[PDB]
Design an enzyme around this catalytic site. Structure first.
Site, PDB file in Angstrom:
ATOM      1  N   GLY A 189       0.810  -1.163   0.000  1.00 31.83           N
ATOM      2  CA  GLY A 189       0.000   0.000   0.000  1.00 31.83           C
ATOM      3  C   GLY A 189       0.867   1.245   0.000  1.00 31.83           C
ATOM      4  O   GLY A 189       0.613   2.164  -0.758  1.00 31.83           O
ATOM      5  N   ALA A 190       1.893   1.280   0.856  1.00 34.90           N
ATOM      6  CA  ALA A 190       2.698   2.497   1.069  1.00 34.90           C
ATOM      7  C   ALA A 190       3.900   2.155   1.952  1.00 34.90           C
ATOM      8  O   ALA A 190       3.952   1.074   2.571  1.00 34.90           O
ATOM      9  CB  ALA A 190       1.874   3.583   1.709  1.00 34.90           C
ATOM     10  N   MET A 191       4.843   3.090   2.027  1.00 38.59           N
ATOM     11  CA  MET A 191       6.146   2.817   2.639  1.00 38.59           C
ATOM     12  C   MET A 191       6.715   4.018   3.334  1.00 38.59           C
ATOM     13  O   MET A 191       6.848   5.081   2.725  1.00 38.59           O
ATOM     14  CB  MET A 191       7.129   2.294   1.574  1.00 38.59           C
ATOM     15  CG  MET A 191       8.502   2.025   2.169  1.00 38.59           C
ATOM     16  SD  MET A 191       8.414   0.530   3.403  1.00 38.59           S
ATOM     17  CE  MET A 191       9.857   1.085   4.592  1.00 38.59           C
ATOM     18  N   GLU A 192       7.079   3.832   4.606  1.00 39.66           N
ATOM     19  CA  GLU A 192       7.420   4.919   5.527  1.00 39.66           C
ATOM     20  C   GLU A 192       8.856   5.450   5.477  1.00 39.66           C
ATOM     21  O   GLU A 192       9.334   5.999   6.476  1.00 39.66           O
ATOM     22  CB  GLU A 192       7.162   4.459   6.966  1.00 39.66           C
ATOM     23  CG  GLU A 192       8.179   3.373   7.443  1.00 39.66           C
ATOM     24  CD  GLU A 192       7.669   1.942   7.328  1.00 39.66           C
ATOM     25  OE1 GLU A 192       6.786   1.688   6.466  1.00 39.66           O
ATOM     26  OE2 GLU A 192       8.153   1.056   8.089  1.00 39.66           O
ATOM     27  N   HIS A 251      -0.960   6.230   9.079  1.00 44.33           N
ATOM     28  CA  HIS A 251      -0.057   5.073   9.246  1.00 44.33           C
ATOM     29  C   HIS A 251       1.403   5.397   8.934  1.00 44.33           C
ATOM     30  O   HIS A 251       2.241   5.293   9.821  1.00 44.33           O
ATOM     31  CB  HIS A 251      -0.510   3.867   8.402  1.00 44.33           C
ATOM     32  CG  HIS A 251       0.231   2.595   8.698  1.00 44.33           C
ATOM     33  ND1 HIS A 251      -0.288   1.609   9.508  1.00 44.33           N
ATOM     34  CD2 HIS A 251       1.432   2.131   8.268  1.00 44.33           C
ATOM     35  CE1 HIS A 251       0.561   0.597   9.572  1.00 44.33           C
ATOM     36  NE2 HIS A 251       1.615   0.887   8.826  1.00 44.33           N
ATOM     37  N   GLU A 252       1.707   5.817   7.706  1.00 45.22           N
ATOM     38  CA  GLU A 252       3.107   6.008   7.300  1.00 45.22           C
ATOM     39  C   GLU A 252       3.814   7.119   8.078  1.00 45.22           C
ATOM     40  O   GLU A 252       4.981   6.981   8.456  1.00 45.22           O
ATOM     41  CB  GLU A 252       3.245   6.253   5.780  1.00 45.22           C
ATOM     42  CG  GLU A 252       2.600   5.212   4.862  1.00 45.22           C
ATOM     43  CD  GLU A 252       2.959   3.749   5.167  1.00 45.22           C
ATOM     44  OE1 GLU A 252       4.062   3.427   5.647  1.00 45.22           O
ATOM     45  OE2 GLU A 252       2.098   2.902   4.888  1.00 45.22           O
ATOM     46  N   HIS A 276       4.724   5.853  11.555  1.00 42.55           N
ATOM     47  CA  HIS A 276       5.989   5.069  11.472  1.00 42.55           C
ATOM     48  C   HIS A 276       7.227   5.906  11.743  1.00 42.55           C
ATOM     49  O   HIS A 276       8.296   5.368  12.053  1.00 42.55           O
ATOM     50  CB  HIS A 276       6.143   4.426  10.088  1.00 42.55           C
ATOM     51  CG  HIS A 276       5.623   3.014   9.978  1.00 42.55           C
ATOM     52  ND1 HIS A 276       5.887   2.038  10.922  1.00 42.55           N
ATOM     53  CD2 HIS A 276       4.882   2.411   9.013  1.00 42.55           C
ATOM     54  CE1 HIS A 276       5.332   0.901  10.548  1.00 42.55           C
ATOM     55  NE2 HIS A 276       4.721   1.096   9.389  1.00 42.55           N
TER      56      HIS A 276
HETATM   57 ZN   LIG Z   1       3.390  -0.083   8.316  1.00 36.72          ZN
END
Ligand SMILES: [Zn+2]
Length: 864
Positions: A254-257, A290-291, A294
């Protein structure tokens, strides 16, 4: 090769400084590193992970004596004191179809490094307990790549006379290699800002294509909300003056921090009301949050090793859930998370790939980005909050950061921080991380005297990794209702209240709820206080009472869920006997009460009217014929549809009025649309011919994507030719929006029509479809694999099709393939005919030369 948590050992080497130089050309990118290495265990060989083409390696400016075998580079003669290593690698990013490492997408360059993609860029000690300070220089053609980004602060840059240019990025925070990011592209920027509580402006930049830029506004607003919230709720402030978000349409997660440079799938970044549903907006708000969350829980404090993944993922999911619930609709959102866990995590825990929240071993770490690690992980974090309360939870968080800021730590460490900050023993709580499987609570209650006596047993089933399961620390939140459904107070332990948390720590315990002066039905596991199965002997009238009168959202919803499950059980029986369907008098009474109740929150109403999925329904069964469960569920749904047909129309109209032409996203308008879409689904089940009326007023009703999606979902199983016409028109209308095209393919794949397999095969060849695009593959092929009547067709056509695609996809994207092959996870539990066919499919997949480690691990779990 298998990796075992018990084998963990501190690294022999530390990397203090990582200097990277990227020279981007067509087609090749050349990477030059300079590593400042500090010996921890002097005289050990230096071992570097790496899979990119190797051009040179030097130790202190002189060519190194080394050996490269497989993906491991070893240098035996290394100095006893600090030294440098310089590696030159060469990458062809447009050939990288795995979307791990450095890769091309839409003519731009992007990275994905977690967990082990950085070793695909350069040779490195590619493990998260090795933290280093990165400075990245990037050189590229200015016209082709005007935008050059990496983590941290942009500290230099300039032009060259030949049309090239460069930038230099300095990330002053030590980080593991999985948090590295680089973007090079021709991208549009949307700028905004946040001012931290200590008065520091943070420049916000979202990068997208020029065409997608108008769709990024809601994500920007969501980030600012998230930043303010982490300050107010957690006391956490951002630590750089720049925060970048880059949207990319080819992305596995989905996505990356990545620190200060998050990279996101477009689906969790882009929305407007014309092209995105209310659920899409909700998703953007959660994931954007969320990200960002993180940044503390994962970046400032990271993971000692990948077995510890849930340390950051469980905690960050809990954080995004709390953020979303604080925004709006807490109870409705809690139920949605519970429902998700039960529909997807419970089967994982009951199946061949089951694992502890903290695995003891893995072959391929890509396989462990899982419902268990993330969602069950979050339930585990939430139990700290349930046991300790908010203030106590926050005390734990504060000590966690005091102890571990700047470190790579373990789940044990987070537990200890929660334990220590609150002066409490949570030794037994460690079993939440190390024991797989869903605990089963066996409950019985008795009002003898003025004491309500609740006895509670617990076991946890063996799972393929572990037979022995010891008693666990399980909070059971409880209340009690009298025969008119009102709250009844009780004593425990020394306190007089209407609700208590009963802490089950033993194989069997009795709880005494004293001073009960009236007959009671108990309310149990309130708020889903622990992630367990609970069996209490409830009558149908008990459930009706709970459903009508209970003060807790979960327990009311659970009572309806139980009624639906018993109804489906009763259908399975009559269909097996070849007799008339059951009457379901009590259920229909209960559902009538819900439809007609106007005191009910619209979105909560909609949940109460949702019937458990097939997988929920066959939970715990053997020799499953998935089509028998499907037929029984379908029968229930059709009975509800027809029985209340004119009342679905009426609720629909009432919802339309209350929505009041407010087509933009808001949680309030979204609640009414959710309800409207449930009514639409029932209407079209009962009166399929209503499709032509819908078609005639479609333009009029298509006031946003929530409506278009809800209409098209409602008609999607309709055997009318008009259903194919409406889908074609949708594809034509939104041909230019890749994220709406995803919806189109999901509808193609998910249809209950009899002809779905051949339409899916046609769709493979649609000009907008791309097998190499993860969103497309999942939308079309993933949805088919979940399409019960079609995936589990008796002739095996569905099994052969999915196996064919696992084979084909695995040739370029092992992560997409390994997720897809898990559609076969039900194998051992199937009736013999289907089982046989599934085992053939998996054997054929296993027989493929060059099968990835990713897919091989899963197939072995199912087969062996
Ligand atoms: Zn995560």
């Amino acid at each position: 090769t298998v990796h075992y948590l018990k084998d963990y050992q501190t690294p022999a080497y530390h990397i203090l400084k990582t200097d990277l130089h990227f020279d981007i050309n067509e087609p090749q990118t050349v990477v030059k590193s300079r590593l400042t290495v500090e010996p921890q265990r002097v005289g050990e060989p230096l071992v570097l992970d790496g899979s990119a083409k190797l051009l040179s390696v030097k130790i202190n400016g002189a060519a190194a004596d080394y050996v490269l075998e497989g993906e491991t580079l070893t240098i035996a003669g290394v100095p006893s004191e600090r030294f440098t290593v310089e590696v030159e690698t060469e990458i062809l990013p447009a050939e990288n179809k795995s979307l791990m490492g450095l890769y091309a997408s839409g003519g731009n360059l992007f990275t994905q490094c977690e967990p082990e993609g950085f070793r695909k860029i350069t040779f490195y000690i590619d493990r998260p307990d090795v933290m280093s300070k990165f400075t990245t220089t990037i050189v590229a053609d200015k016209k082709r790549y005007p935008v050059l980004l990496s983590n941290g602060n942009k500290i230099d840059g300039g032009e060259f006379s030949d049309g090239r240019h460069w930038v230099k990025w300095e990330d002053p925070f030590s980080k593991p290699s999985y948090l590295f990011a680089l973007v090079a592209g021709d991208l549009a920027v949307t700028e905004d800002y946040f001012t931290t509580m200590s008065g520091r402006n943070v420049k916000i930049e979202f990068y997208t294509t020029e065409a997608d830029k108008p769709k990024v506004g809601f994500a920007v607003e969501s980030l600012k909300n998230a930043m303010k919230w982490d300050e107010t709720r957690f006391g956490l402030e951002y630590d750089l003056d720049i925060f970048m978000v880059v949207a990319v349409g080819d992305f596995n997660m989905g996505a990356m921090e990545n620190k200060g440079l998050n990279i996101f799938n477009t689906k969790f970044v882009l929305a407007d009301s014309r092209t995105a549903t209310d659920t899409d907006f909700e998703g953007i708000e959660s994931v954007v949050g969320h990200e960002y969350f993180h940044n503390w829980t994962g970046n400032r404090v990271t993971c000692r090793d990948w077995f510890q993944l849930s340390l950051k993922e469980g905690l960050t999911v809990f954080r995004d859930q709390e953020f979303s619930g604080d925004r709006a609709s807490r109870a409705v959102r809690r139920i949605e998370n519970i429902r998700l866990l039960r529909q997807h995590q419970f089967p994982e825990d009951a199946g061949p790939t089951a694992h502890p929240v903290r695995p003891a071993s893995y072959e391929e770490m890509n396989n462990f980005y899982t419902m268990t690690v993330y969602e069950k992980g979050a339930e585990v974090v939430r139990m700290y909050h349930t046991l300790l309360g908010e203030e106590g939870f926050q005390k734990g968080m504060k000590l966690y950061f005091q102890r571990h800021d700047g470190q790579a730590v373990t789940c044990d460490d987070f537990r200890a921080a929660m334990a220590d900050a609150n002066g409490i023993n949570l030794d037994q709580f460690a079993l939440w991380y190390s024991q797989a499987g869903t605990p089963v609570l066996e409950a019985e209650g008795r009002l003898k005297n003025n004491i309500f006596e609740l006895t509670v047993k617990q076991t946890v089933p063996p799972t393929p990794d572990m037979t022995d399961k010891q008693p666990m620390m399980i909070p059971v939140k409880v209340g009690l209702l009298n025969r008119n459904g009102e709250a009844v107070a009780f004593d425990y332990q020394g306190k007089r209240a209407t609700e208590a948390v009963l802490l089950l720590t033993e194989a069997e315990q009795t709880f005494l709820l004293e001073g009960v002066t009236e007959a009671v039905v108990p309310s149990l596991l309130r708020g889903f206080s622990a992630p367990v199965h609970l069996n209490y002997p409830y009558s149908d009238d008990d459930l009706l009472l709970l459903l009508a009168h209970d003060s807790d959202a979960f327990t009311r919803w659970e009572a309806a869920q139980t009624l639906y499950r018993r109804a489906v059980a009763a259908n399975l029986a009559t269909l097996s006997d070849g007799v008339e369907l059951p009457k379901h008098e009590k259920l229909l009474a209960a559902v009538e009460k819900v439809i007609s109740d106007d005191l009910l929150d619209n979105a909560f109403k909609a949940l109460l009217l949702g019937v458990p999925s097939e997988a929920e329904l066959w939970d715990g069964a053997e020799n499953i014929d998935p089509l028998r469960y499907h037929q029984a569920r379908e029968a229930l749904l059709d009975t509800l549809a027809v029985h209340f047909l004119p009342k679905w129309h009426e609720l629909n109209r009432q919802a339309a009025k209350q929505e009041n032409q407010s087509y933009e996203y808001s949680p309030e308008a979204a609640g009414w649309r959710t309800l409207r879409n449930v009514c639409r689904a029932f209407v079209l089940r009962a009166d399929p011919a209503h499709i032509e009326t819908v078609a005639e007023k479609y333009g009029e009703m298509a006031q946003n994507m929530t409506h278009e999606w809800g209409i098209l979902s409602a008609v999607n199983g309709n055997e009318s030719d008009t259903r194919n016409r409406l889908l074609a028109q949708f594809a034509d209308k939104f041909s230019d929006d890749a994220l709406v095209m995803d919806k189109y393919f999901a509808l193609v794949g998910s249809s209950r029509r009899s002809d779905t397999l051949q339409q899916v095969r046609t769709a493979l060849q649609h000009p907008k479809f791309s097998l190499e695009n993860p969103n497309k593959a999942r939308s079309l092929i993933g949805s088919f694999s979940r399409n019960v009547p079609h995936f589990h067709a008796e002739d095996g056509s569905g099994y052969r099709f999915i196996a064919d695609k696992v084979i084909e996809i695995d040739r370029f994207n092992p992560q997409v393939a390994a997720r897809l092959v898990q559609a076969f996870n039900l194998c051992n539990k199937l009736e013999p005919h289907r089982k046989n066919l599934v085992k053939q499919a998996l054997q054929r997949i296993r027989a493929q030369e060059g099968l990835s480690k990713d897919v091989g691990e899963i197939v072995g779990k199912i087969l062996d």
